[PDB]
Subunit: 313 residues, 4 copies
């Protein structure tokens, strides 16, 4: 037997670069092949990342090619073409598809038959596109979806209540983006519902809470305006998902998973808490949503479905 976990990373941007670094520091997988149009960056990054190895568990890190995905456990897609100013949502999707096909087809042709973890934006759309171009089962194609939005939502609630975010449990669902929403109904701190927390701590105005989600929804714009880009959050979420898969944990995580009736949706990948392990998506959690929240999910899905429909035609 050979216990050697190999990860292929497509896209060596700040997100990919950081993701890899997060993998190094936590000792996840024993090999990372970095694939990117800019061969020099990848080469210089593989060296810089390996410089760090003697302080953690060993790995083989190198500039790779799509064929190196032959025997990979995982393929992480991270650098979608950014939306130019004045470009339509549908055109952003279409320019990425041509690029996506150019990545998926040759990886699939290498023989690769592991799990696709998509982080490229628009993530939900490109997840479904990856599933469609790869042909892989619905549960072997995962998108980061609302994992970071959810983390940001939890850290925010944690700061307000001064509690370890790992004792805070709340989700952000729907399509990653403007049309996402908070699942306040099932949000809790140590099992104590937010509602219950508020009705015991009246100092928490319903305004602060409403603004709190608004801020998570716009978190990326704020950070980009400040430091020019965002990457630590998504890189950390990506390593978390990788760990859950590679360590076969059956952990519940907000991810973009194929819809088959849940929430009253069908044939689209959208953000929802799900059980993931070595074989990809197992159980797709379906939180009994509030009428208002179900509407928010419906609206989010619908908008995404229309774009998706127009996209493939």
């Amino acid at each position: 037997d050979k216990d050697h976990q190999k990860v292929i990373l497509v896209g060596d941007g700040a997100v990919g670069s950081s993701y890899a670094y997060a993998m190094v520091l936590q000792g996840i997988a024993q090999e990372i092949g970095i694939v990117d149009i800019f061969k020099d960056k990848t080469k210089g990054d593989a060296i810089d990342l390996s410089n760090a190895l003697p302080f953690t568990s060993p790995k083989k890190i190198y500039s790779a090619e799509y064929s190196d995905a032959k025997d990979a456990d995982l393929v992480v897609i991270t650098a979608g073409a950014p939306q130019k100013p004045g470009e339509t949502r549908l055109d952003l999707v279409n320019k990425n598809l041509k690029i996506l096909k150019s990545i998926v087809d040759p990886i699939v042709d290498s023989g690769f038959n592991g799990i696709f973890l998509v982080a490229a934006n628009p993530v939900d759309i490109l997840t479904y596109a990856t599933w469609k171009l790869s042909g892989f089962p619905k549960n072997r194609v995962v998108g980061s979806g609302t994992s970071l939005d959810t983390a940001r939502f939890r850290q925010s609630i944690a700061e307000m209540v001064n509690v370890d975010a790992r004792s805070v449990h709340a989700y952000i669902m729907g399509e990653h983006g403007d049309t996402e929403f908070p699942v306040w109904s099932h949000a809790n701190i140590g099992g104590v519902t937010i509602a219950e927390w508020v009705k015991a701590h009246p100092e928490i105005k319903e305004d602060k809470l409403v603004k709190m989600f608004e801020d998570v929804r716009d978190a990326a714009y704020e950070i980009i305006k400040l430091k020019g880009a965002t990457f630590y959050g998504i890189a950390t979420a990506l390593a978390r998902i990788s760990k859950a898969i590679l360590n076969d944990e059956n952990a519940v995580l907000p991810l973009s998973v194929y819809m088959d009736g849940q929430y009253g949706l069908n044939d689209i990948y959208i953000g929802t808490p799900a059980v993931i392990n070595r074989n990809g998506i197992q159980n797709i959690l379906e939180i009994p949503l509030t009428d208002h929240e179900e509407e928010s999910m419906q609206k989010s899905a619908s908008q995404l479905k229309k774009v998706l429909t127009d996209a493939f035609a």
Copy 2:
């Protein structure tokens, strides 16, 4: 500065020793002093534990004396002698011989009590020591809760870290499961059952029953139980030493919560560098509230009688 975390462990039985191992393995704290009547046992144990150190971060481990608690950050009590009121009084005397000489040493860190009966001895420790309420902690239903969650996790096949459920009240027969708030990934048990009707309501009932009798069954099989509490104790320690503000089910002092007062009982609480910071008062259903009431009542009874 003085970035040196020190732990004093009282009681070198299977629980105490297992706890020490867990601290070594996870590299929690830099020093561990083991206090116990059997000096030879503790000496062989500190050597055996130190033998593992080159495979983890370094620590100073040794057989200790109460006087060594002078500058300890934490004192962990596991020394609990095996009528309920009798059991209590024989432990109240042993506990006094531990607490007093430790307080006389100059110790003013945090007390973590794991000796049974935990809730009672947790209270007794607080009274014997004179320390502030938030600086005497008991493991309470931490282990029951972990067992409760692992059981749900196996039933549903989901990492227990994604399962959230509590066992509350006094650690013992009267403890109860807070089903009203138990959930998986935020998805309520009640709701989980609706989506998975294969899970019979009576299977849930046995599950908690099996948790309440957990110690009995284990002791019957391997003679004793210790890996669970040892791990729980080390978890509680990482929460304090790393100032996490983590929510853990611990035995804490009641000051109104659930309509109780003047007792240490099990309930979710925020903990950090300075001990208990906030006591999470879950809104229990009528059913659960009674369970909580009765458990408190019977516990307060013994408490008063004991003193």
Copy 3:
């Protein structure tokens, strides 16, 4: 693909029990099957060990049988029949062989084709016996050998010099037992030889050093006399070796490996620093020993070879 590391543990004594617990706390492997004549102990231990899971990464822990080794990555043998008083070395070996055969044959018959990690005493002898009864390649049968003796030697040197034992590098070699010896020639603290350390810190009498090894050699007797048994050390060494294999690290570790000319030895398993990974033993390090040390190795090997010879006949 399926990244699920499974470990089968034979022997649920204080060593096996602790080993498993060390695996749990560090999150190594995703499944541990505990096999032992005393089915109840194993059952009660699997429950107690699992009680700890919600505080670490998940695992499947259960009382198992030899057939459960079918698809195991690793098989850890830990509870050899103890040497009764007045029993000869050769008779200790022979009573264990009958027991060993009863373990190896049915595990091999389950289909199992991973790596054998032997900790049972006498370890070096039973390692070779395991290799002989299993037929597995020489590099897929490993004995804990002098890993703990070496660790004990390093912690000892560390305490004297007050330095982190991970910055101390020294070995104990030969057959685990009375005939082992310290490799002072290549022992160093941060690269600074012991000799060099002494010739800069004259307060270190050559007496303290001589007694220091004597104490490591007799470490087990001291601890047994005190706490009645020894287990944390070996359990920790066992988890370390497991990690090196399961994480394919190519780490150098003192282990009992087949001899093919190194040190002037042949056809016996004996303690020596070696490179191990997912496929077992790779490079067998051969420290250029001192004449005196080479003699100590020769003497250790010879004694072990004679017993081994008589054993198989």
Copy 4:
């Protein structure tokens, strides 16, 4: 008690930010204050880093001011502006504006210097601050050494944690490899070559050459270098905050070692909660000793001239 470790980071460039991430990921320390001229950049960075916190232990991360160093355990300096003597003087002024306001805050923990030229600025920091010699540390050849070991590891296909070799002297052109003591699993390089003659002597030569020019090559490929030093810095931090007494190659003050005096230069040293405890003086060969001598000499030259 006060089990709260605080780090103040000065310089939010790729190195500073990467270092902060490494602290978050490994869960080292409980608070991180980031000081830098670009307040907006540091604010977006603290938010971006905090976004990762729910996946690791909790921390308080924020844009900080020198005054926040009042009760910090550690101050990490990465702010180093890009003739050698000129480079030095322009950094000596920037360094002063950092050190002075931090010392005025009341800070009396440990200074970890990572800004180039590291050894010089390490010395300058010591002089500007007035702190004890063992409480001003420089990364020195920590990264060079790591790179050196990773290179040997790839050549031989062995976990670098099982490789032991140093890069010594002033971090820069004059640094040299201490081949006489370099080893793999305790098995000397010289000895390793005898057993594996395929390893040409000139391949070893290029190896160090590639280490000396490491930064150049990386910068040429990806524009900058930071993951290595970031990881090294976080390693040095875990050694202090966890009081490990670990042996690391750092820039430390010379007081006789290698026949040098009044300078901070790279060499193996024991480090812990209180900074440098012991300076490991490796018995260098004649060849290596000269290398060490010359490196010191040229460094002492600039040092004196600069001041």
